[PDB]
Design an enzyme around this catalytic site. Sequence first.
Site: not given
Ligand SMILES: [Zn+2]
Length: 258
Positions: A62, A92, A94, A104, A196-197
Amino acid sequence: HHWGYGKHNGPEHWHKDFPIAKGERQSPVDIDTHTAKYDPSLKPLSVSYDQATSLRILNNGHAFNVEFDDSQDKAVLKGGPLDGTYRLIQFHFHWGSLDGQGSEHTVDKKKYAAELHLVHWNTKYGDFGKAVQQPDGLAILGIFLKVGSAKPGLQKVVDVLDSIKTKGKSADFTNFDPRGLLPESLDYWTYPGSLTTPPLLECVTWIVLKEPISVSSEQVLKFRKLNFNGEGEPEELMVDNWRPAQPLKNRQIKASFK
Ligand SMILES: [Zn+2]
């Protein structure tokens, strides 16, 4: 679970397995700089990463996580909107398939090329898994990325990605200094929200820095060579691994700066 960011399992489907996706405190959100209000009660924010101990980098299918030793107060976030001490567990990103998308959070509907999340858990709850069950369990420091100059402090991350191309691969990743990913200013916006996941738990105090960092087109192009799939499986580039903005509902975004 088979959630993802593809054509049939993306964010708009997550609510079927994770009904909190339609909850009251979901993230990310759009940050309207014309309605966020300066809050003179925010205390100074404190990022203490001098003793951080990175251990490993993992492609989890992911994103990739740079993981830290969180068994002592080695890398902590304090101050700002927070009460107490929050320990860094991982960071991490995105990112997009195109430079015009990837973040995001958005700022007045602007999408950045990527967004960095430094994830910290509240030491009063003892471990991460207990912390995510609490409304004040996590503090996530979000930093926007735009494409321009290279970020020298990111290059050691870029250069290990070939070794973790596919889902489930990890590599040793010691002695990485996350201070090299910060912008100059620590001015921020803050609001209460969620992961957000999946599992999308409403356990996060979000702290989103106003000032983006710059990364080069070559650096983002290497992120875009990662794979969502495992080794031996059909190649699916790890791109567009972002959730879009969710309704603000009964929340206010507060600014640390005038
Ligand atoms: Zn994140």
